[PDB]
Design an enzyme around this catalytic site. Structure first.
Site, PDB file in Angstrom:
ATOM      1  N   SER A 155       1.723  -8.777   2.167  1.00  0.00           N
ATOM      2  CA  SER A 155       2.107  -7.488   2.465  1.00  0.00           C
ATOM      3  C   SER A 155       0.508  -6.949   2.355  1.00  0.00           C
ATOM      4  O   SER A 155       0.260  -5.747   1.074  1.00  0.00           O
ATOM      5  CB  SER A 155       2.876  -7.083   1.802  1.00  0.00           C
ATOM      6  OG  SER A 155       2.349  -7.712   0.211  1.00  0.00           O
ATOM      7  N   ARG A 170      -8.180  -4.321   5.699  1.00  0.00           N
ATOM      8  CA  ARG A 170      -8.854  -3.383   4.576  1.00  0.00           C
ATOM      9  C   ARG A 170      -7.710  -4.110   3.634  1.00  0.00           C
ATOM     10  O   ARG A 170      -6.684  -4.679   3.605  1.00  0.00           O
ATOM     11  CB  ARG A 170      -8.514  -1.768   4.940  1.00  0.00           C
ATOM     12  CG  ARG A 170      -8.765  -1.239   3.204  1.00  0.00           C
ATOM     13  CD  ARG A 170     -10.443  -1.596   3.147  1.00  0.00           C
ATOM     14  NE  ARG A 170     -11.055  -0.871   3.489  1.00  0.00           N
ATOM     15  CZ  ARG A 170     -12.969  -0.374   3.399  1.00  0.00           C
ATOM     16  NH1 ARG A 170     -12.763  -1.679   2.867  1.00  0.00           N
ATOM     17  NH2 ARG A 170     -13.501   1.187   3.730  1.00  0.00           N
ATOM     18  N   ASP A 209       8.155  -7.726   4.196  1.00  0.00           N
ATOM     19  CA  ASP A 209       9.576  -8.098   3.991  1.00  0.00           C
ATOM     20  C   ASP A 209      10.455  -7.622   4.370  1.00  0.00           C
ATOM     21  O   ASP A 209      11.672  -8.165   3.976  1.00  0.00           O
ATOM     22  CB  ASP A 209       9.412  -7.648   2.369  1.00  0.00           C
ATOM     23  CG  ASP A 209       8.007  -7.904   1.098  1.00  0.00           C
ATOM     24  OD1 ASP A 209       7.617  -8.957   1.542  1.00  0.00           O
ATOM     25  OD2 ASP A 209       8.069  -6.537   1.063  1.00  0.00           O
TER      26      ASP A 209
END
Length: 491
Positions: A155, A170, A209
């Protein structure tokens, strides 16, 4: 006038002002139609080559049936922690659990320049400790053994060129580490896994998720997915409402105009008809063309926020901001002389009503369904768990305000679900056509009646109250752990 006369006039004026704030907070069904139509428009703009919505293809072309066999693994990593889970699918709509929650490493990541090798070797070290701990079933057979597929929940900002392929762009909400801006994160994890010693582990999936929530709802579908018996209904939306909000749904392959026709035809030449789109619907209508906004929303987004003006729908819906909006409304009504009216000025108020986010969401949880508690007994107490005490006539209006904030957040949360259901219609299996959408997160699961208001909004939308009741919806809760394993299964 008398002190009592002034008090009565003030209470009447508070009635007026609180009703006016509520009116400024309302969501009309006309505005519902406007918002859902603009969301359909942004959806269709988004997934065509250039922008409407960040509709990122999740590269999953299959949904679990709830009848699945085998044991798989699942790795997730974020600023919160690192987790290695293992799921044994029992063969019915059940499963068995095992997991190790390896805490985020103590300051090998605190904006130091560390290698991708350091971080991913920590990941693989914890994976190896996992394999040693619960089963060296095929780890003792370290040279070779029957392999194990696992999904990766990474994530972070990632450019997912395909399933089991991610190119990190990033480290945001994390900390900057050296030279991962081009690396493939699944490749780094696989390298480190095969380098500690397990070559059996295959990293074959990469999802976040929400796609995991959808897949975890496909499995465990309340006996409405095993066969066309009883209720005949399929799950078409996974979504998380709570501290954050997002969703994903399956769109036709040849309707994703964004993906090149090579991959589209190579998939449709297979048995592959649809693919999961992770609609980033957080940060929807940031330009505020249609999205309703009040004064408090602006003052929170600008001054007190960490994302100044980026995830606007998130902030209107997130569970953190509900108590914050209430706090701002209370401080406003106070400094304008209507509420908590013997704290003679600001900075005489309690320490939590003055400071930013100290008004939590469990406050609204206790306040919203206040039963006839002999006029606000649990509500007074819980609102008083923070330092401020209150009076009955004030508590009535505070409850009004809390309920208004909650209703607005719930109707807004219902807008994108309605737009998705009406884009890919639920009225195509002409008889008994039903659809269940499964939900995770704080607000949707535990906020009192947030699902009832979701249903009322879905009825008030251009999804017709006539047709809303072919959509019943409930909760599927584990997406980082079970959803990743199921994405590895369907890989």
């Amino acid at each position: 006038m008398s002190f009592d006369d002034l008090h009565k006039a003030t209470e009447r004026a508070v009635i007026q002002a609180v009703d006016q704030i509520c009116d400024d907070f309302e969501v009309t069904p006309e505005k519902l139609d406007e918002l859902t139509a603009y969301f359909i428009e942004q959806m269709e703009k988004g997934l065509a080559p250039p922008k409407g919505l960040p509709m990122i293809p999740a590269f999953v072309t299959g949904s679990p049936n709830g009848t699945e066999r085998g044991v798989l693994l699942a790795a997730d990593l974020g600023g919160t922690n690192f987790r290695i889970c293992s799921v044994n699918l029992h063969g019915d709509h059940t499963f068995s659990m095992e997991q190790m929650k390896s805490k985020i490493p103590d300051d090998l990541l605190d904006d130091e320049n560390v290698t991708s090798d350091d971080l991913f070797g920590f990941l693989a070290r914890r994976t190896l400790a996992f394999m040693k701990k619960y089963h060296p079933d095929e780890l003792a057979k370290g040279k070779d053994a029957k392999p194990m597929k696992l999904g990766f929940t990474f994530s972070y900002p990632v450019d997912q060129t395909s399933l089991n392929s991610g190119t990190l762009i990033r480290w945001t909400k994390g900390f900057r580490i050296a030279d991962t801006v081009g690396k493939d994160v699944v490749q780094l994890y696989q390298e480190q896994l095969s380098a500690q010693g397990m070559p059996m582990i295959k990293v074959v999936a990469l999802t976040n998720d929400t796609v995991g929530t959808y897949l975890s709802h496909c499995y465990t579908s309340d006996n409405t997915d095993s066969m066309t018996s009883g209720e005949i209904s399929e799950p078409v939306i996974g979504c998380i409402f709570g501290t954050g909000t997002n969703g994903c749904y399956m769109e036709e392959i040849n309707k994703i105009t964004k993906l090149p026709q090579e991959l589209r035809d190579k998939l449709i030449k297979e048995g592959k008809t649809h693919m999961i789109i992770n609609v980033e619907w957080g940060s929807f209508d940031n330009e505020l063309k249609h999205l309703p906004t009040t004064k408090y929303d602006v003052v929170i987004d600008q001054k007190l926020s960490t994302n100044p003006g980026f995830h606007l729908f998130e902030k209107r819906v997130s569970g953190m901001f509900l108590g914050e909006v209430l706090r701002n409304i209370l401080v406003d009504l106070h400094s304008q002389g209507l509420l908590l009216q013997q704290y003679r000025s600001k900075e005489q108020l309690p320490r939590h009503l003055t400071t930013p986010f100290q008004l939590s969401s469990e406050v609204l949880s206790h306040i919203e369904i206040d039963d006839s508690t002999g006029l606000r007994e649990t509500e007074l107490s819980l609102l008083q768990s923070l330092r401020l005490p209150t009076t009955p006539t004030e508590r009535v209006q505070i409850q009004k305000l809390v309920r208004a904030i909650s209703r607005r957040s719930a109707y807004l949360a219902a807008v994108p679900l309605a737009a998705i259901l009406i884009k890919t219609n639920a009225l195509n299996k002409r008889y008994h056509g039903e659809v269940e959408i499964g939900c995770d997160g704080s607000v949707v699961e535990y906020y009192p009646g947030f699902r009832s208001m979701l249903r009322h909004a879905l009825a008030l939308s251009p999804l017709g109250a006539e047709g809303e009741r072919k959509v019943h919806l409930k909760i599927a809760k584990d997406g980082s752990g079970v959803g990743a394993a199921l994405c590895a299964l369907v890989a």
